[PDB]
């Protein structure tokens, strides 16, 4: 049944629905029926991904459907081309095959890089099965979790995780942590009474996911499965459909360049083609095989490998990510939404201060002891590390002496638990200390008398006296002490101390910490003698008059790496927001501690408190920051919050829901941000699915934060996303370096061609060594830009801006088709004609020849100098002029990888060798073009040929021509970085 | 997009004066190359090591030359003709009065440039050595007979040399049908299909203006009609070269002939 109605019934009224008993559980028969009726009591996971449909997807995208558009129009050339019958036509289907391969071998190297992602994700997950302790028949034994039906009569203790969705029936001092769902980082009280109607703010209700500390409750199952508060939390946010990511869409907006070029140049050659003369089918199919020539076949996979190595470079570090794209969110990411409790803060109880010799002392809070410890060298702290120590039942599950303190678990309450590891961690083997001074009595607490005190025998016998020590909170404790420790001395509790205690008592509540009063007293040995029968019962020993140590106290405190972590995101542009469902206390406290509320800053209610001016007429410009809880935050608007969030630069959401999360987000990035949220739990996974790169913790996280995420911290060191900054927006950089690169190649590519239809010159380059270049020899170096170092202090930049500032922008590709594009195929051209000119063409002739030299039934065809050539020897000429042009394109590719090294530094201050990859690349470019050439056969298995080593160095003179332009645009941008020159030749 | 209107001007003179300044350079590259390069001699001829030799009348189908007439239907093989007619149209007498009677048979070294307008001098050949089967005196050139005359012609390379044992002769002969036909009966014009050796070397449209180059005729008698035959037609010189399977014309020609009746 329904979730408002389950914590509003009697027991009368629940035991009726279910058939249950309230004292005895369900019958074995009929529980066993029910869970026939609504399956194991687990999460279905996210189903149907079937293998070959994973595969599918790898093969759309911007750049895929762009080069299936191309082999799609590359067949229908071919069919065109059969039609009117042509031979050679092998270029359209070696074509259009070559780029049906690219696309196909990019979507198995995605394919097998996720499958490796998942698996090294799932090698990281819990696989044990929860259990429950189950009543029925009136039998309590032990079942799985997942063996749980609604209706059910169920216990929790300490320790134990709530196995289902429970009502409570009776509870015995049952806290309980929900930080899973909500964000509240102290312990929630669990009673069976209604607290509320909203069965989340409710005490009765116990929730499917979380974590029983202390206390015992029996109670109902009402809600199973996908049907619990945390089955609900994750079918909503599978029901969140992401957004594109924002390489995704740069990569798009490229390609609405590269079509929007090839359209509007092919369109313009084809109105041409047709006046030259030339049937409209031909003129169509140059227009054809130009907006083919305007596709890059192989830049779809330097850009993939490009992402896999940065993916790679992460996961050395224990940052897996699932998809390649999101290598890049992290870069120009502009606002972080962060989680508090798990994620930002430990979820973890440490001491924290410490009242004791008249001063509050602070503790360390870091897992990898790396703050800074307090003083520890007082007669007062050795007694109060005594009592805190002795007066303590909790104890460290065994075999752990591997594990550090922090990440042992402990048996024992929450605040126990804390003062174990405390003890453990500067007294040092604390439950051993603890054994050698016997425990003769013992009160845990209770509301009778409102402590916990227990009397002991010293640790030397020829002291055979007792020690009673005792603690609880701290008015509790005081009302019962006469004597206060202080400097070595006991002095009496004048009205001094009673105030220093209650200033310190408060200025330590205020922080939203939990505090206790610890206290001792050593019972004479001649009332207490060895052997003294003491009495709970009755009281026989003291339990006033007893002598104050301190106060102790303890907070959910920051991950070690992260504040630091925070600074560095900040410094470096981005902004961060904390979304927490804790209460607004504690939210500011972390906020303050990790570096979201600047040391320094105020809400508007904190102005009030020292303007002594109603918070009404405090200003709202002059807050800076701003906590606004849950509850405020639903009066508000779309409009509301816009107005809050460009007011208020940290700002903080505490009693935030997982649906508030989502709406925080939506905010943000509906005002142009690219936002990343980061999580642990299931109230993140909406938000985390929202986000434009959802970023959930490997250990602490739950499987919908884990699921909903990206991206995953394996270690759970939040400092990943600091370097996640730095990678993300290095590789969009050595992006635009890449494809810069790839580009300049289309346009001595297609002048050729131009040519050969425009004016009828032999034709100078063949599509089979087009292949060869694209997909062969320039590959290798394009990736090389991946490994260049930041020209900048890249880490002290803003996010780059979403609207200005894109991955492929108008002049960067102008820039590349018409002025370095154009500098390249008049290097063809050159050494081309002069070998026609050389071996017996002069340009002249070379016009209009095309119809006589390419014609098969011409097997005599006489030069500028009249010897007649027949067509094979001829062919061996135009494969020549191919092979020409060719080492015509890879002498200036050399001087086009060393000039997009760098975007505006000279590459004499970076220098010529810093990337080691990149000369590997060119000696790897170098050595494949002599391979294609002067290896036997070549002439016939592709079109290569032995060249006259003369024409090798033909193009040089243009290289280098190459390497001094963009060096005296790049010497002139940065010296002289005016307006003129700044934007027209940049990219 | 055309968002600055005035400022294209600037970006347009720059693109505009950008690639004045590059076409420039491109035309000082051939501007130079073109000096570089002699009038006279290939820098290279690297394609060329052995020479192209083609045949007419040149009658292609799919996959190669397959000459298909009938004596009787004189449609068949009038088009053979004109083709053959309007071929020798430049080796008449009349229109070869711009060379010279040539005697020394062995070779012509033209060491001096000896003709009007620095030109040198070029051998005659009229169609009178190929002497069954010129224009006159049948103008069918046996293909009416039923035993047809096909000239064979060497490509031409400046300064090439095929030879100095024997002159380089033209041996056609029937491919892959001797089971039951004899072989293949041929006498060429001039007699044992030779070239005369004095045409060589070749010195080029600017040296010899009105170079032609020399002919031998194959008139086949032998051929079976009504069947499908292959011939082959090989030159034979020591700097010769006929079989390579990249190119099928160096040296040789090969075409199916039916000749219908
Ligand atoms: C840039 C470029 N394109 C070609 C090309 C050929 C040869 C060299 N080519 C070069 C250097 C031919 O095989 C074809 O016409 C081919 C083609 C392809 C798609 C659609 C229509 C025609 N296009
Ligand atoms: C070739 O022979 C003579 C030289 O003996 C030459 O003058 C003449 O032009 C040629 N013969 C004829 C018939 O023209
Ligand atoms: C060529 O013609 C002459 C006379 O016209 C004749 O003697 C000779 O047999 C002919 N050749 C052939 C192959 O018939
Ligand atoms: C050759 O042409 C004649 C006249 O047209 C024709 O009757 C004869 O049958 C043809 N021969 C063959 C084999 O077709
Ligand atoms: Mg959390
Ligand atoms: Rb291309
Ligand atoms: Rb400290
Ligand atoms: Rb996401």
Same mark, same amino acid.
């Given at each position: 049944?329904?979730?408002?109605?389950?914590?509003?019934?009697?027991?009368?009224?629940?035991?009726?629905?279910?058939?249950?008993?309230?004292?005895?559980?369900?019958?074995?028969?009929?529980?066993?029926?029910?869970?026939?009726?609504?399956?194991?009591?687990?999460?279905?996971?996210?189903?149907?991904?079937?293998?070959?449909?994973?595969?599918?997807?790898?093969?759309?995208?911007?750049?895929?459907?762009?080069?299936?558009?191309?082999?799609?129009?590359?067949?229908?050339?071919?069919?065109?081309?059969?039609?009117?019958?042509?031979?050679?036509?092998?270029?359209?289907?070696?074509?259009?095959?070559?780029?049906?391969?690219?696309?196909?071998?990019?979507?198995?190297?995605?394919?097998?890089?996720?499958?490796?992602?998942?698996?090294?994700?799932?090698?990281?997950?819990?696989?044990?099965?929860?259990?429950?302790?189950?009543?029925?028949?009136?039998?309590?034994?032990?079942?799985?979790?997942?063996?749980?039906?609604?209706?059910?009569?169920?216990?929790?203790?300490?320790?134990?995780?709530?196995?289902?969705?429970?009502?409570?029936?009776?509870?015995?001092?049952?806290?309980?942590?929900?930080?899973?769902?909500?964000?509240?980082?102290?312990?929630?009280?669990?009673?069976?009474?209604?607290?509320?109607?909203?069965?989340?703010?409710?005490?009765?209700?116990?929730?499917?996911?979380?974590?029983?500390?202390?206390?015992?409750?029996?109670?109902?199952?009402?809600?199973?499965?996908?049907?619990?508060?945390?089955?609900?939390?994750?079918?909503?946010?599978?029901?969140?459909?992401?957004?594109?990511?924002?390489?995704?869409?740069?990569?798009?907006?490229?390609?609405?360049?590269?079509?929007?070029?090839?359209?509007?140049?092919?369109?313009?050659?084809?109105?041409?083609?047709?006046?030259?003369?030339?049937?409209?089918?031909?003129?169509?199919?140059?227009?054809?095989?130009?907006?083919?020539?305007?596709?890059?076949?192989?830049?779809?996979?330097?850009?993939?490998?490009?992402?896999?190595?940065?993916?790679?470079?992460?996961?050395?570090?224990?940052?897996?990510?699932?998809?390649?794209?999101?290598?890049?969110?992290?870069?120009?990411?502009?606002?972080?939404?962060?989680?508090?409790?798990?994620?930002?803060?430990?979820?973890?109880?440490?001491?924290?201060?410490?009242?004791?010799?008249?001063?509050?002392?602070?503790?360390?809070?870091?897992?990898?002891?790396?703050?800074?410890?307090?003083?520890?060298?007082?007669?007062?702290?050795?007694?109060?590390?005594?009592?805190?120590?002795?007066?303590?039942?909790?104890?460290?599950?065994?075999?752990?002496?591997?594990?550090?303190?922090?990440?042992?678990?402990?048996?024992?309450?929450?605040?126990?638990?804390?003062?174990?590891?405390?003890?453990?961690?500067?007294?040092?083997?604390?439950?051993?200390?603890?054994?050698?001074?016997?425990?003769?009595?013992?009160?845990?607490?209770?509301?009778?008398?409102?402590?916990?005190?227990?009397?002991?025998?010293?640790?030397?016998?020829?002291?055979?006296?007792?020690?009673?020590?005792?603690?609880?909170?701290?008015?509790?404790?005081?009302?019962?002490?006469?004597?206060?420790?202080?400097?070595?001395?006991?002095?009496?509790?004048?009205?001094?101390?009673?105030?220093?205690?209650?200033?310190?008592?408060?200025?330590?509540?205020?922080?939203?910490?939990?505090?206790?009063?610890?206290?001792?007293?050593?019972?004479?040995?001649?009332?207490?003698?060895?052997?003294?029968?003491?009495?709970?019962?009755?009281?026989?020993?003291?339990?006033?008059?007893?002598?104050?140590?301190?106060?102790?106290?303890?907070?959910?405190?920051?991950?070690?790496?992260?504040?630091?972590?925070?600074?560095?995101?900040?410094?470096?542009?981005?902004?961060?927001?904390?979304?927490?469902?804790?209460?607004?206390?504690?939210?500011?406290?972390?906020?303050?501690?990790?570096?979201?509320?600047?040391?320094?800053?105020?809400?508007?209610?904190?102005?009030?408190?020292?303007?002594?001016?109603?918070?009404?007429?405090?200003?709202?410009?002059?807050?800076?920051?701003?906590?606004?809880?849950?509850?405020?935050?639903?009066?508000?608007?779309?409009?509301?919050?816009?107005?809050?969030?460009?007011?208020?630069?940290?700002?903080?959401?505490?009693?935030?829901?997982?649906?508030?999360?989502?709406?925080?987000?939506?905010? +943000?990035?509906?005002?142009?941000?690219?936002?990343?949220?980061?999580?642990?739990?299931?109230?993140?996974?909406?938000?985390?699915?929202?986000?434009?790169?959802?970023?959930?913790?490997?250990?602490?996280?739950?499987?919908?934060?884990?699921?909903?995420?990206?991206?995953?911290?394996?270690?759970?060191?939040?400092?990943?996303?600091?370097?996640?900054?730095?990678?993300?927006?290095?590789?969009?950089?050595?992006?635009?370096?890449?494809?810069?690169?790839?580009?300049?190649?289309?346009?001595?590519?297609?002048?050729?061609?131009?040519?050969?239809?425009?004016?009828?010159?032999?034709?100078?380059?063949?599509?089979?060594?087009?292949?060869?270049?694209?997909?062969?020899?320039?590959?290798?170096?394009?990736?090389?830009?991946?490994?260049?170092?930041?020209?900048?202090?890249?880490?002290?930049?803003?996010?780059?801006?979403?609207?200005?500032?894109?991955?492929?922008?108008?002049?960067?590709?102008?820039?590349?088709?018409?002025?370095?594009?154009?500098?390249?195929?008049?290097?063809?051209?050159?050494?081309?004609?002069?070998?026609?000119?050389?071996?017996?063409?002069?340009?002249?002739?070379?016009?209009?020849?095309?119809?006589?030299?390419?014609?098969?039934?011409?097997?005599?065809?006489?030069?500028?100098?009249?010897?007649?050539?027949?067509?094979?020897?001829?062919?061996?000429?135009?494969?020549?002029?191919?092979?020409?042009?060719?080492?015509?394109?890879?002498?200036?590719?050399?001087?086009?990888?060393?000039?997009?090294?760098?975007?505006?530094?000279?590459?004499?201050?970076?220098?010529?060798?810093?990337?080691?990859?990149?000369?590997?690349?060119?000696?790897?470019?170098? +050595?494949?073009? +002599?391979?294609?050439?002067? +290896?036997?056969?070549?002439?016939?298995?592709?079109?290569?040929?032995?060249?006259?080593?003369?024409?090798?160095?033909?193009?040089?003179?243009?290289?280098?021509?190459?390497?001094?332009?963009?060096?005296?645009?790049?010497?002139?941008?940065?010296?002289?970085?005016?307006?003129?020159?700044?934007?027209?030749?940049?990219? | 997009?055309?968002?600055?209107?005035?400022?294209?001007?600037?970006?347009?003179?720059?693109?505009?004066?950008?690639?004045?300044?590059?076409?420039?350079?491109?035309?000082?590259?051939?501007?130079?190359?073109?000096?570089?390069?002699?009038?006279?001699?290939?820098?290279?001829?690297?394609?060329?090591?052995?020479?192209?030799?083609?045949?007419?009348?040149?009658?292609?189908?799919?996959?190669?030359?397959?000459?298909?007439?009938?004596?009787?239907?004189?449609?068949?093989?009038?088009?053979?003709?004109?083709?053959?007619?309007?071929?020798?149209?430049?080796?008449?007498?009349?229109?070869?009065?711009?060379?010279?009677?040539?005697?020394?048979?062995?070779?012509?070294?033209?060491?001096?440039?000896?003709?009007?307008?620095?030109?040198?001098?070029?051998?005659?050949?009229?169609?009178?050595?190929?002497?069954?089967?010129?224009?006159?005196?049948?103008?069918?050139?046996?293909?009416?007979?039923?035993?047809?005359?096909?000239?064979?012609?060497?490509?031409?390379?400046?300064?090439?040399?095929?030879?100095?044992?024997?002159?380089?002769?033209?041996?056609?002969?029937?491919?892959?049908?001797?089971?039951?036909?004899?072989?293949?009966?041929?006498?060429?014009?001039?007699?044992?299909?030779?070239?005369?050796?004095?045409?060589?070397?070749?010195?080029?449209?600017?040296?010899?203006?009105?170079?032609?180059?020399?002919?031998?005729?194959?008139?086949?008698?032998?051929?079976?009609?009504?069947?499908?035959?292959?011939?082959?037609?090989?030159?034979?010189?020591?700097?010769?070269?006929?079989?390579?399977?990249?190119?099928?014309?160096?040296?040789?020609?090969?075409?199916?002939?039916?000749?219908?009746?």
């Amino acid at each position: 049944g329904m979730e408002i109605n389950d914590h509003q019934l009697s027991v009368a009224e629940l035991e009726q629905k279910y058939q249950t008993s309230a004292t005895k559980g369900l019958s074995a028969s009929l529980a066993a029926e029910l869970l026939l009726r609504d399956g194991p009591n687990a999460l279905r996971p996210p189903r149907g991904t079937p293998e070959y449909v994973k595969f599918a997807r790898q093969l759309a995208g911007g750049l895929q459907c762009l080069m299936w558009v191309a082999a799609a129009i590359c067949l229908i050339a071919f069919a065109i081309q059969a039609s009117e019958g042509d031979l050679t036509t092998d270029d359209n289907l070696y074509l259009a095959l070559a780029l049906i391969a690219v696309v196909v071998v990019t979507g198995c190297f995605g394919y097998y890089q996720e499958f490796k992602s998942t698996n090294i994700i799932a090698s990281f997950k819990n696989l044990v099965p929860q259990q429950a302790t189950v009543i029925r028949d009136g039998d309590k034994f032990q079942i799985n979790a997942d063996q749980l039906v609604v209706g059910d009569l169920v216990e929790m203790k300490g320790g134990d995780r709530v196995p289902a969705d429970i009502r409570i029936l009776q509870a015995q001092g049952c806290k309980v942590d929900n930080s899973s769902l909500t964000g509240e980082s102290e312990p929630q009280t669990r009673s069976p009474e209604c607290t509320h109607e909203s069965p989340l703010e409710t005490r009765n209700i116990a929730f499917f996911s979380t974590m029983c500390l202390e206390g015992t409750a029996q109670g109902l199952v009402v809600n199973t499965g996908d049907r619990t508060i945390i089955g609900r939390i994750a079918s909503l946010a599978s029901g969140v459909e992401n957004e594109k990511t924002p390489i995704a869409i740069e990569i798009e907006h490229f390609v609405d360049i590269i079509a929007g070029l090839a359209i509007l140049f092919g369109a313009t050659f084809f109105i041409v083609a047709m006046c030259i003369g030339y049937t409209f089918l031909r003129a169509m199919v140059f227009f054809m095989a130009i907006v083919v020539a305007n596709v890059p076949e192989g830049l779809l996979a330097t850009v993939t490998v490009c992402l896999s190595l940065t993916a790679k470079r992460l996961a050395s570090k224990n940052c897996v990510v699932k998809n390649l794209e999101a290598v890049e969110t992290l870069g120009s990411t502009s606002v972080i939404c962060s989680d508090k409790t798990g994620t930002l803060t430990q979820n973890r109880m440490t001491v924290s201060h410490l009242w004791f010799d008249n001063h509050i002392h602070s503790a360390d809070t870091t897992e990898d002891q790396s703050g800074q410890t307090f003083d520890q060298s007082s007669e007062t702290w050795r007694a109060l590390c005594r009592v805190l120590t002795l007066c303590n039942r909790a104890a460290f599950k065994s075999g752990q002496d591997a594990v550090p303190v922090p990440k042992r678990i402990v048996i024992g309450d929450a605040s126990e638990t804390a003062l174990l590891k405390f003890s453990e961690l500067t007294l040092g083997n604390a439950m051993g200390y603890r054994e050698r001074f016997p425990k003769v009595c013992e009160i845990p607490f209770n509301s009778t008398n409102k402590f916990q005190l227990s009397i002991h025998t010293l640790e030397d016998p020829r002291d055979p006296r007792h020690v009673l020590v005792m603690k609880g909170a701290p008015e509790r404790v005081l009302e019962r002490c006469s004597s206060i420790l202080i400097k070595g001395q006991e002095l009496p509790l004048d009205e001094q101390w009673r105030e220093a205690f209650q200033t310190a008592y408060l200025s330590l509540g205020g922080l939203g910490e939990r505090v206790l009063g610890f206290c001792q007293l050593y019972l004479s040995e001649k009332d207490y003698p060895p052997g003294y029968a003491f009495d709970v019962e009755a009281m026989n020993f003291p339990t006033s008059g007893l002598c104050f140590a301190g106060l102790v106290s303890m907070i959910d405190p920051p991950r070690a790496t992260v504040p630091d972590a925070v600074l560095k995101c900040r410094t470096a542009g981005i902004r961060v927001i904390m979304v927490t469902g804790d209460h607004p206390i504690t939210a500011k406290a972390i906020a303050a501690s990790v570096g979201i509320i600047s040391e320094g800053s105020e809400t508007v209610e904190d102005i009030a408190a020292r303007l002594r001016v109603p918070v009404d007429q405090v200003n709202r410009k002059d807050a800076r920051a701003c906590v606004i809880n849950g509850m405020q935050l639903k009066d508000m608007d779309p409009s509301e919050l816009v107005e809050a969030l460009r007011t208020h630069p940290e700002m903080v959401f505490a009693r935030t829901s997982p649906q508030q999360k989502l709406v925080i987000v939506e905010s +943000c990035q509906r005002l142009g941000a690219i936002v990343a949220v980061t999580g642990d739990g299931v109230n993140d996974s909406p938000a985390l699915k929202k986000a434009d790169i959802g970023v959930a913790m490997g250990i602490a996280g739950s499987d919908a934060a884990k699921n909903a995420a990206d991206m995953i911290l394996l270690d759970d060191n939040f400092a990943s996303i600091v370097t996640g900054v730095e990678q993300g927006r290095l590789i969009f950089d050595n992006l635009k370096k890449s494809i810069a690169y790839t580009l300049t190649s289309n346009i001595p590519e297609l002048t050729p061609y131009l040519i050969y239809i425009t004016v009828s010159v032999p034709l100078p380059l063949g599509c089979i060594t087009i292949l060869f270049i694209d997909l062969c020899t320039d590959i290798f170096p394009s990736v090389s830009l991946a490994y260049e170092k930041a020209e900048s202090d890249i880490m002290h930049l803003r996010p780059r801006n979403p609207k200005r500032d894109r991955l492929v922008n108008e002049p960067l590709a102008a820039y590349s088709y018409f002025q370095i594009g154009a500098i390249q195929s008049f290097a063809g051209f050159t050494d081309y004609f002069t070998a026609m000119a050389q071996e017996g063409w002069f340009p002249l002739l070379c016009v209009g020849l095309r119809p006589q030299w390419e014609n098969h039934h011409l097997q005599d065809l006489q030069d500028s100098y009249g010897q007649e050539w027949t067509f094979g020897q001829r062919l061996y000429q135009q494969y020549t002029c191919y092979t020409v042009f060719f080492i015509s394109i890879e002498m200036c590719q050399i001087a086009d990888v060393l000039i997009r090294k760098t975007r505006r530094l000279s590459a004499f201050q970076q220098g010529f060798f810093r990337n080691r990859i990149l000369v590997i690349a060119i000696v790897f470019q170098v +050595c494949i073009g +002599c391979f294609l050439c002067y +290896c036997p056969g070549m002439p016939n298995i592709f079109n290569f040929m032995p060249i006259r080593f003369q024409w090798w160095l033909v193009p040089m003179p243009f290289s280098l021509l190459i390497f001094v332009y963009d060096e005296i645009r790049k010497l002139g941008v940065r010296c002289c970085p005016g307006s003129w020159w700044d934007q027209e030749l940049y990219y | 997009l055309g968002r600055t209107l005035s400022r294209w001007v600037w970006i347009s003179l720059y693109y505009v004066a950008f690639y004045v300044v590059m076409s420039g350079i491109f035309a000082l590259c051939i501007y130079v190359l073109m000096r570089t390069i002699d009038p006279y001699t290939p820098d290279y001829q690297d394609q060329l090591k052995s020479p192209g030799v083609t045949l007419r009348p040149d009658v292609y189908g799919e996959k190669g030359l397959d000459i298909s007439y009938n004596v009787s239907d004189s449609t068949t093989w009038a088009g053979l003709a004109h083709t053959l007619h309007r071929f020798l149209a430049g080796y008449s007498p009349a229109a070869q009065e711009g060379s010279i009677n040539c005697t020394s048979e062995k070779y012509f070294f033209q060491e001096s440039f000896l003709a009007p307008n620095h030109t040198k001098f070029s051998c005659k050949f009229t169609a009178d050595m190929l002497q069954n089967c010129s224009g006159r005196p049948d103008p069918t050139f046996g293909f009416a007979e039923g035993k047809p005359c096909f000239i064979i012609k060497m490509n031409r390379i400046v300064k090439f040399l095929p030879g100095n044992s024997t002159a380089p002769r033209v041996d056609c002969a029937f491919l892959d049908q001797p089971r039951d036909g004899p072989p293949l009966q041929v006498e060429y014009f001039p007699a044992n299909g030779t070239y005369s050796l004095h045409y060589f070397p070749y010195y080029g449209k600017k040296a010899q203006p009105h170079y032609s180059n020399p002919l031998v005729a194959a008139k086949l008698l032998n051929v079976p009609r009504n069947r499908d035959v292959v011939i082959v037609c090989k030159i034979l010189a020591e700097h010769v070269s006929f079989d390579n399977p990249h190119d099928p014309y160096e040296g040789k020609v090969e075409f199916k002939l039916k000749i219908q009746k």
